[PDB]
Design a protein around this nucleic acid. Sequence first.
DNA 1: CCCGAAGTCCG
DNA 2: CGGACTTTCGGG
Length: 231
Amino acid sequence: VPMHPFVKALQEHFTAHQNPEKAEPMARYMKNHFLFLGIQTPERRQLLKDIIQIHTLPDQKDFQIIIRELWDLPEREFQAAALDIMQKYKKHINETHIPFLEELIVTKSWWDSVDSIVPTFLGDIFLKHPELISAYIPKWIASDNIWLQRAAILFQLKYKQKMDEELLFWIIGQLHSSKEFFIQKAIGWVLREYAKTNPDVVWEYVQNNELAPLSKREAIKHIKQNYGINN
DNA sequence: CCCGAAGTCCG
DNA sequence: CGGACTTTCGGG
Ligand SMILES: Cn1cnc(N)c2ncnc1-2
C-alpha cells in the first residue's frame, strides 16, 4: 500500500528545500539521535501550509495514519510536522487517544517530541478526565522508560490553579531519587512553573523534601528572590 | 520587539 | 556541581 498522498507530497516538498549545512548543527543539538533535513521551524511551518493549501487537510479518518507515517520517516522534521498536523486535528482528540499518544511518546523519543506531546495533548485530556489519571500515571512511573516518567511529571505543567498538588508531590516523591538528567530537570521545571502560581507551597516542599540538587536549584530559580538566601 | 523555556565551555 | 554563555522556539 502506497504512502498516503498527503505524506508523500510533504516529503517531496520538504526534501526540495533541505539544507545540509544547517542539518549538521541541528542534528548535533539533538546528540545525533536523528537525521535532519535542515529546515527550521518558520520555514517548516510554511512548507506544511503550502501543502495544506494545495491538497487540503486529509479527512479525520486518516489522522492517525498520517501521523504514524510521518513518525516512521527518518528525518526529525517529519515528526515536528506530525505534531503540527496533530494540532490541526485537536478538536477530534479525546480520552480514547491516550494509548495512541503513549505510543508516540515512546517511539523516536527525545525532549523535543515528548515536551510537545505531554503538557498540551495529554494535559488537556487529563484536565477533562481526571478520573483517568490513575489508569496511566502509576504504570508510567513504574516503567523503565524515562520518557513516560517525564510525561507523568509534566502533564500538569500548564494547570496553574487546577494543579492537583497532592498528586504532583506524590509523583515527584516517586521519582526524586532518579539519576536521569531528563527526570531531575523535569521535576525542576514543573516546580518552577507551579511556583508562579503558588510559591509558598513550592518553597515549603523544596525546603523539607529530598530532591536532586539540580531539581531544587531549577525549582527556586525565581522564587529564591522572594524568600532570600540564608547565610 | 520583548522575555522565559535544551546545548557547550570552563573553573 | 553549576555559572556563563549559545541558538532556537513559544508566546506576548
Ligand atoms: C531550547 N532552548 C534554547 N535556548 C535556551 N536558552 C533554552 N532554555 C531552555 N531551553 C532552551
